[PDB]
RNA sequence: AUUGAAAGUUGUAGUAUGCGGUCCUUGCGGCUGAGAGCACUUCAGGAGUUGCCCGCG
């Protein structure tokens, strides 16, 4: 019973929902997205087996993988220690994707970044083995980018660290199961990546409005069974 | 290699042109540092003294 706990220092991330013209960037970042991250990490440290002919297909097999050795398809969740924050940029954003309008259109479109300092991710496994644990924790960390490709993300540390039954207030994210059986906040970020599902989430932010931006901080959901702790800190967490 | 992938909010643009801090103006006129005033009053270069001493054109 293993957890990782990887925390990444970042300008912005530009993950969105399903919008036109705006995309409408998630209040936070999708397990989808999450899941993707470490997909990649690994396809890349090890290419053996793992990278096959088509890359949309090494991608949904290591996908899949990963999904197996999850306990639930639910299982990543971030903590929103720093504030969070939204911006709006005017990008020139060319949309060619429409069907005609040749090649040489310009159509300035305007997009949305979020604004936080840093996040902690924790990836749940179960039992997993030292020659590929070792391979895991150093995929924890070369998560470069996170959504969009000028959203930089840097992971500055990565553990494993053990939950060992701790009774503290929730922090991590969850979705919406038990918090409904215990400045609530419901929203859908798409469990699995799309290829050619959605489940209601509990999203732990309040707003707090001491500055122009009212922004979000933490809601402290009721005490949880599972805890983990951090340089001194103890923070909730679920599983199932 | 994350509904992400391709992407300039881009290119060209003088707050610029003529516009006296300008023309007249005494720091000007009158004005005793002047009147009174002993370097004065007392005073010996003074008292002693053999050109000295010998001499046949």
Redesign the pocket.
Known sequence: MDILLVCLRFPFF?????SYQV?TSFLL??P??????L??GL??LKPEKYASSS??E??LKAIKEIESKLVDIKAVSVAPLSPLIRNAF????????ESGSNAEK?D???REYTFTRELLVAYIFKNLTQEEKNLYLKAAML????????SL?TPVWASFVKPEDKKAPLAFSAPYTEIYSLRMYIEKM?V?????QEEIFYLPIEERRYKRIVYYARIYPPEVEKALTVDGEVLGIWIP
Do not use: H, W
């Not at 530009?14 to 399903?18: I, L």
């Not at 989808?32 to 991250?37: C, P």
């Not at 005017?90 to 994707?97: G, Q, Y």
């Not at 699995?192 to 050619?196: G, H, I, K, L």
């Open positions: 530009s993950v969105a929902k399903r995309r970042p999708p989808s997205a999450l899941k993707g991250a997909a990649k396809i890349l890359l949309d090494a991608a005017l990008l020139k954003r060319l949309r060619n994707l310009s300035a479109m305007r998560i470069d980018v996170i959504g969009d490709t000028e993300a798409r699995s990546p799309e290829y050619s």
